[PDB]
């Protein structure tokens, strides 16, 4: 079924996350955390207070796919056992210092070929696959993109709904 999923996405906000490598997305799936650059960190903290759900939709660069989507369960927090992110060039551990907790909604992939009919009004109506890390996706486009993912039958949204 999709009814609880649609309830979680109701009036949600959506942000595109572009990860430079697969390792960090795998780590996020295993540990339920994400970290971003300070400019996007501030944006996500503001959104977390503003909406019933904030959804991160993940895409590893050069993969041609999205790798899933997750809901923020907290604002960013510092002061913890360092998440062993794989850092690309120019990326330092301090720039990824804020850790958001997230609850995965779908850990299944979706190829960009299946989202070619969705454009994002907040990025000049370019295909939704196009955008830098942190690009906000307008409500209707983000809802339809999330609904395109294959169902993840390993997940129970009952606990997510009560976090709302
Ligand atoms: C753990 N967070 C991240 N990991 C990698 Cl590899 N790239 C990122 C990123 N946040 C923004 N970008 C471009």
Residue numbers in the entry: 344 to 507
Describing publication, verbatim:
During the initial stages of the campaign, we identified that a chloride substituent located between N6 and N4 fits into the small pocket forming a halogen-hydrogen bond donor interaction with the side chain hydroxyl of Ser362 (C–Cl···H angle = 76°; Cl···O distance = 3.8 Å), which substantially improves the binding affinity. However, the adenine aromatic core cannot form a conventional hydrogen bond with Asp476, unlike pyrazolopyrimidine 1 moiety. Considering the synthetic challenges, we decided to pursue the optimization using 2-chloropurine 2b instead of 5-chloropyrazolopyrimidine 3. This approach offered the advantage of convenient derivatization at N9 of the purine moiety, as compared to C3 in the equivalent position of the pyrazolopyrimidine core.
N6-Adenosine methylation (m6A) is a prevalent post-transcriptional modification of mRNA, with YTHDC1 being the reader protein responsible for recognizing this modification in the cell nucleus. The YTH family, comprising five proteins (YTHDC1, YTHDC2, and YTHDF1–3), is the best characterized family of m6A readers. Predominantly localized in the nucleus, YTHDC1 is responsible for the regulation of pre-mRNA splicing and mRNA export from the nucleus. In this study, we present a structure-based design campaign aimed at developing a potent and selective ligand of YTHDC1.
